[PDB]
Amino acid sequence: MANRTVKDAHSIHGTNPQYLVEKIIRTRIYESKYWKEECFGLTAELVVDKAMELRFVGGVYGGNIKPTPFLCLTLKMLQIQPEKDIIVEFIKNEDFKYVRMLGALYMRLTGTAIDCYKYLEPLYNDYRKIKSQNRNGEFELMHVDEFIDELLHSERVCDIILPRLQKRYVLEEAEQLEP
Numbered sequence: 001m002a003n004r005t006v007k008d009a010h011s012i013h014g015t016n017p018q019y020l021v022e023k024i025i026r027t028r029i030y031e032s033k034y035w036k037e038e039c040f041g042l043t044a045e046l047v048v049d050k051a052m053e054l055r056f057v058g059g060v061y062g063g064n065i066k067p068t069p070f071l072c073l074t075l076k077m078l079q080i081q082p083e084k085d086i087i088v089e090f091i092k093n094e095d096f097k098y099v100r101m102l103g104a105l106y107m108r109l110t111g112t113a114i115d116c117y118k119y120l121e122p123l124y125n126d127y128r129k130i131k132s133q134n135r136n137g138e139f140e141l142m143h144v145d146e147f148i149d150e151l152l153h154s155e156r157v158c159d160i161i162l163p164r165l166q167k168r169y170v171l172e173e174a175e176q177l178e179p
Helices: 023-031 033-038 044-051 069-080 084-092 097-110 113-125 144-153
Strands: 129-133 139-143
Touching: 023 033, 023 069, 033 069, 044 069, 044 084, 044 097, 069 097, 084 097, 084 113, 097 113, 097 129, 097 144, 113 144, 129 144, 139 144
Parallel strands: none
Antiparallel strands: 129 139
16 A cells, blocks of 8 residues: 555654554544645655645644644655655754754654754744644644744644653664764
């Protein structure tokens, strides 16, 4: 199936990276028009085109837990596991705050503690306003640094449980660099 994690991908927190997202939420995403239309055939280098069109952050909303585009792209990234510097580039980008948010969440889901501290803590300096779609369908306003604070200190963001951070200096592929 085209919804299966790519074959070259390695495990994340000891499991399929897509499994970080609730099963019923994954099923809703797979069924969604956004996944079927915008996410179909999306490769690592193509994600940014869709990420640049994002207009808010969020998880799911409503009595049938409809996923946001933000959440759909997050799962797609979990599925195809982009090379690290793509994620870093999203984070470092200053023109598109939602691209920054998407990279930041993905980094929190997949990175080491060292990764998160290195790449996310500088974003505490970002006070820009962002739209967030809450469980009821409304759009609330928050700041980037608040989203970052939640990534670093909350249990859940965009309706995804944030995995236990790995303290130990750990690499998951042989060809990874050694900072």
